[PDB]
UniProtKB/Swiss-Prot annotation:
GO terms for cellular component: extracellular region. It is found in: Secreted. The keyword Lyase applies. It holds the Pfam family PI-PLC-X. GO terms for molecular function: phosphatidylinositol diacylglycerol-lyase activity; phosphoric diester hydrolase activity. It catalyses: a 1,2-diacyl-sn-glycero-3-phospho-(1D-myo-inositol) = 1D-myo-inositol 1,2-cyclic phosphate + a 1,2-diacyl-sn-glycerol. Keywords: Lipid degradation, Lipid metabolism, Lyase, Secreted, Signal, Virulence. This is 1-phosphatidylinositol phosphodiesterase. The keyword Lyase applies. The active site is at residues 29, 79. InterPro entries: PI-PLC_domain, PLC-like_Pdiesterase_TIM-brl, PLipase_C_PInositol-sp_X_dom.
């Protein structure tokens, strides 16, 4: 059977001497937005329909958490202005549970401030994350804390590896975990060095593209990963795109085209490096069309 027939424990079947960078990983964009039900707001604000545990069971390993500091000891999960009805501890507890049941999987968690803090907040978003989550004894042992800038599957499995989109941090483990953080270019394909120059991060995050240009931008970065065997290069390729608003087509409508288009492309490339591909509506299938999460999973070499 191929890896995608067992999406709950697919990383356990790989060689754990691999660097996480060399693994083709399915992520979910604004992972926490499964809570949204409002049909008008959901056109633009909702990007997932499966909860965190169901996403994990479906093979998702990269989680894009964007947040707002709602108190000096709390981060609320957000899409922009829009509160996603739970705090960061919910994601971390779900992750902890999953990883105890599937201990040979790693999860990478991107962390970003998406909206201004509650006006009662006195601390920076990075201080709140560092002090109340990363260093919280409640999540002792859950996070990767090693000093390797380019960690392997073996030293990260059973743990959450920070992908830091907070800016400069005092945290010292994970991607972009230094006092410069990650220089993100807005609505762009870009590359930048991270981890004190140890890694070259290559991103496609052209989130306002219309779908034809979006597909072209995805495929361009997909074509570059394919011929690149450098473990010090890290690819993050977002298939997700903004809706123009509630008058306009939904994020779901776009994903319903982009996902099978990209899944078909990956499948026709066979076993080939993809990078980390971050999708809307992870695990959402359409009869007669390739499934993007499954194809990312099956693109890994055994």
């Amino acid at each position: 059977d191929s890896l995608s027939k067992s999406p709950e424990n697919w990383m356990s079947k790989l060689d754990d001497g691999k660097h996480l960078t060399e693994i083709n990983i399915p992520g979910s964009h604004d992972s926490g937005s499964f809570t949204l039900k409002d049909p008008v707001k959901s056109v633009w604000a909702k990007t997932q329909d499966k909860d965190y545990l169901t996403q994990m069971k479906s093979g998702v390993r990269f989680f894009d958490i964007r947040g707002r500091a709602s108190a000096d000891n709390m981060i609320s999960v957000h899409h922009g202005m829009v509160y996603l009805h739970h705090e960061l501890g919910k994601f971390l507890d779900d992750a902890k549970y999953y990883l105890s049941a599937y201990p040979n999987e790693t999860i990478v968690m991107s962390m970003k401030k998406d909206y201004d803090s509650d006006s009662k907040v006195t601390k920076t978003f990075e201080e709140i994350f560092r002090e109340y989550y990363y260093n919280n004894p409640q999540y002792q042992n859950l996070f990767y804390t090693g000093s390797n800038a380019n960690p392997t599957l073996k030293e990260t499995k059973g743990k959450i590896v920070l992908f830091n989109r907070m800016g400069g941090t005092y945290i010292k483990s994970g991607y972009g975990a230094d006092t410069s953080g990650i220089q993100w270019a807005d609505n762009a394909t870009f590359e930048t060095k991270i981890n004190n120059g140890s890694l070259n991060l290559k991103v496609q995050d052209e989130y306002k593209d219309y779908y034809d240009k979006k597909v072209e931008a995805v495929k361009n970065l997909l074509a570059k990963a394919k011929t690149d065997s450098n473990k010090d290069n890290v690819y993050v390729n977002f298939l997700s795109v903004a809706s123009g608003g509630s008058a306009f087509n939904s994020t779901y409508y776009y994903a319903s085209y982009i996902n099978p288009e990209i899944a078909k492309t990956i499948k026709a490339n066979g076993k080939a490096r993809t990078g980390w591909l971050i999708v809307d509506y992870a695990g959402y299938t359409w009869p007669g069309y390739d499934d993007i999460v499954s194809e990312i999973i099956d693109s890994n070499k055994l």
